[PDB]
């Protein structure tokens, strides 16, 4: 309950870090298959 920790109380809360991670988990595996299937 109370008296959580220190190493997880040092977390900055409403930073992005996971909307950034949501893009890179849906941009990087979606652009890996773009240049392996790429013809002009």
């Amino acid at each position: 309950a109370d008296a959580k920790a220190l190493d997880e109380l040092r977390k900055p809360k409403f930073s992005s870090k996971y909307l950034i991670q949501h893009v890179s988990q849906k941009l990087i595996p979606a652009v890996k298959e773009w240049e392996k299937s790429y013809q002009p």
Binding site: D2, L9, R10, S15, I28
Partner: protein
């Protein structure tokens, strides 16, 4: 979890939720787990895009851990703020800002053979008051030679412009005779040391003059946000901020299963823990277990 490339960026990082998953990954390797192979592929367009979106996961908690020195007297809170952003960029995989923006110039103008083109491809990275002050000096040299000034340098028509654009740089306030001698150096290390100490005198006066302009804009933004907010009645304020809080919780609760929205609402619970642990003992603050 980490995908073996995020954990390599979070080794040198020092923010809390990245140091929590590294210490969880380091505890697994002690318990007989095999480290996976680092991927020997993903060509230079994909690799610099992974660097862009992995440095952004080290920068973004690190920016929120750096207190802005708003409304402080002196340069040392501004130099603390710039030094915290330097060590954040060094942990996120960036080099010095001098090395990282000069790499940006040589990347933007790899194919530009005329000096009018380097003033038109590096327009986003140089000041528009300094892009204009080098376009007027360009046309004063473009009128004399009656020809496009080429981006070669050993042409004598180049240093017709380069000795005139150096006069602009000292007019703007930056010693270009000191900056050029730092990136070229000298033979002896004793005379390279006194041009180093005159370069970093400019450099420390450059980022502190740039961090303070970033602070003086946050000071001016919060002052115009507050004076717009102090002109309302309180009942308008209480229902405008309860509407924006409710519009942003339903933005996070309609998206479920996403890692960002689950961790968003876990932080809404962690703010409510902070307000509950202060109400138990307000003279001591939040209860930290030790």
């Amino acid at each position: 979890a980490v995908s073996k490339k995020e954990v390599l960026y979070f080794l040198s990082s020092k923010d809390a939720e990245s140091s929590t998953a590294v210490k969880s990954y380091l505890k697994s390797l002690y318990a007989g787990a095999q480290v996976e192979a680092t991927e020997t592929d993903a060509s230079e367009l994909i690799a610099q895009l992974e660097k862009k979106y992995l440095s952004a996961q080290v920068v973004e908690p690190g920016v929120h851990n750096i207190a802005l020195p708003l409304g402080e007297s002196g340069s040392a809170p501004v130099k603390r703020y710039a030094a915290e952003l330097f060590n954040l960029g060094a942990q996120a995989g960036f080099e010095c800002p001098f090395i990282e923006v000069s790499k940006k110039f040589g990347q933007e103008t790899a194919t530009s053979e005329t000096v009018k083109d380097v003033l038109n491809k590096t327009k986003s990275y140089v000041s528009a008051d300094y892009n204009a002050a080098l376009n007027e000096v360009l046309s004063s040299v473009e009128a004399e030679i009656n020809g496009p000034v080429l981006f070669d340098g050993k042409t004598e028509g180049f240093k017709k412009f380069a000795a005139k654009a150096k006069a602009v740089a000292v007019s703007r306030g930056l010693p270009a005779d000191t900056i050029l001698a730092y990136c070229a150096g000298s033979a002896n290390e004793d005379a390279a040391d006194k041009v180093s100490k005159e370069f970093f005198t400019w450099f420390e006066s450059a980022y502190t003059a740039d961090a303070a302009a970033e602070v003086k804009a946050i000071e001016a933004e919060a002052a115009s946000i507050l004076d717009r907010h102090l002109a309302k009645p309180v009942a308008q304020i209480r229902k405008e901020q309860a509407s924006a809080y409710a519009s942003l919780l339903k933005r996070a609760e309609t998206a479920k299963g996403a890692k960002w929205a689950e961790k968003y609402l876990e932080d809404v619970k962690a703010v409510q823990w902070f307000d509950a642990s202060v109400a138990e003992a307000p003279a001591s603050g939040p209860k930290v277990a030790a």
